[PDB]
């Protein structure tokens, strides 16, 4: 869940994840592993749904 790896899971992580799936930004290799919420080897809308539900 901690996309940027700053130690806290918040709205900034979800924004980075959503922008990554929308291909606006690229994530670093470390961030890619942390963005993979369900750990299935891909970063997509399923991760987005899970992280957004976690924050809500």
């Amino acid at each position: 869940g901690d996309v940027n790896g700053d130690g806290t899971i918040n709205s900034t992580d979800l924004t980075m994840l959503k922008r990554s799936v929308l291909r606006a930004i690229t994530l670093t290799d470390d961030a890619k592993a942390r963005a993979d919420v369900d750990k299935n080897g891909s970063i997509n809308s399923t991760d987005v749904l899970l992280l957004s539900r976690y924050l809500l």
């Binding site: 929308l22 291909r23 891909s42 997509n44 809308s45 399923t46 991760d47 749904l49 899970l50 539900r53």
Partner: protein
């Protein structure tokens, strides 16, 4: 499984047309989230916006639905993830998922084709089988 249909429309050069994206064969559990990339020619079509269809029921649609347009990369991207937290804003019926607004720049065929699909899951977070039909503007 689920069939995603990129609509086929015709239009004159200089006019703005709407290219519907259809969701066919929506399962009983519905569709809680999906993302996919379409390819297009920026020299033929200028995509100025993408709007959510009527099958997205979120009263604040931007919370569940977002898109991006990249002319330099010749792709458009869709991101849906229902924002209720309970599965309430999931897509449950067939119809228009999104409407692509494009201004026709030339008489050449304006192909909008399937490029990549990411997640496509129901309310039980089970990934659904999905197939894509290519379309666009003046492609017939």
């Amino acid at each position: 499984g689920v069939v995603v249909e990129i609509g086929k429309v015709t239009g004159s050069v200089g006019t703005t047309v709407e290219i519907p994206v259809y969701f066919r064969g929506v399962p009983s559990k519905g569709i809680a989230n999906c993302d996919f990339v379409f390819r297009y020619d920026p020299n033929v079509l200028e995509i100025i916006g993408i709007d959510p269809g009527d099958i997205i029921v979120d009263p604040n649609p931007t919370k569940s639905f977002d898109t991006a347009i990249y002319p330099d990369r010749k792709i458009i991207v869709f991101l849906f993830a229902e924002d209720s937290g309970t599965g309430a804003y999931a897509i449950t019926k067939d119809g228009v998922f999104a409407k692509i607004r494009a201004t026709v720049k030339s008489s050449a065929p304006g192909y909008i084709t399937f490029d990549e699909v990411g997640g496509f899951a129901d309310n039980d977070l089970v990934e659904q089988k999905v197939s894509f039909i290519d379309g666009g503007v003046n492609v017939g």
